[PDB]
């Protein structure tokens, strides 16, 4: 819960977070 | 930076004519709209680092 630490590799973990739920979105257009 | 016609607009414009902060807010809301329709919570923080 604390502030982000020096050195944490936020670029990857940002990317990961967006891409995991991709399974729950519809692939048509809706 | 007004709407002179309608229809979706290209992000290349929004950055150019309206500002660094405008396009960043365009993406985050228009992507979060798709996730938030599906009940998926993704803090803007992440979407921002990509921008």
């Amino acid at each position: 819960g604390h502030i982000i630490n020096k050195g944490e590799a936020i670029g990857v973990i940002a990317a990961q977070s967006i891409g995991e739920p991709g399974t729950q979105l519809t692939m048509r257009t809706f | 930076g007004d709407v002179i016609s309608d229809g979706p607009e290209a992000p290349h414009d929004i950055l150019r004519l309206r500002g660094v902060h405008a396009v960043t807010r365009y993406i985050v809301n228009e992507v979060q709209d798709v996730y938030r329709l599906q009940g998926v919570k993704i803090n803007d923080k992440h979407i921002e680092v990509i921008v």
């Binding site: 729950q24 809706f30 | 938030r36 329709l37 009940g39 998926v40």
Partner: protein, 140 residues
């Protein structure tokens, strides 16, 4: 049609030489069209309200494929209902104006009993069917 049953209306008793535009008939058809338009608007609203509860409540990963499947059908359907309302509204303008009741391609008149069946009819039986044939041919 259960349409006439829901309302206290009985099949219209067309008289022998009965015309087509009197005070009473346009007041009669205006109410039906307005009532018909108001019901669809309430239906579109109920649809949107149901869809948001699904969007607000989050299903479990296992029943996601079933909820997602059902959510897409409503959405498609919802957009279909909105088009119909615009079509009736367009038909409501034809009643008010003076260009309702005839085929748009050829001047032939569309049947009276046929228009009571589908008041949104744009073509006569002959022209409409050929269009569907070209359709299946121009598409596939």
């Amino acid at each position: 049609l259960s349409i006439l049953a829901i309302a206290g209306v009985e099949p219209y008793q067309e008289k022998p030489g009965e015309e087509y535009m009197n005070e009473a008939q346009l007041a009669h058809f205006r109410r039906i069209l307005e009532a018909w338009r108001n019901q669809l608007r309430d239906e579109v609203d109920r649809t949107v309200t149901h869809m948001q509860d699904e969007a607000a409540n989050f299903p479990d990963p296992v029943d996601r494929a079933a909820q997602e499947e059902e959510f897409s059908l409503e959405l498609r359907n919802r957009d279909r209902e909105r088009k119909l309302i615009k079509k009736i509204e367009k038909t409501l303008k034809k009643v008010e104006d003076e260009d309702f009741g005839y085929c748009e391609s050829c001047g032939v008149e569309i049947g009276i009993r046929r228009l009571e069946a589908r008041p949104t009819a744009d073509l006569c039986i002959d022209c409409k069917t050929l269009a569907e044939i070209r359709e299946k041919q121009m598409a596939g």
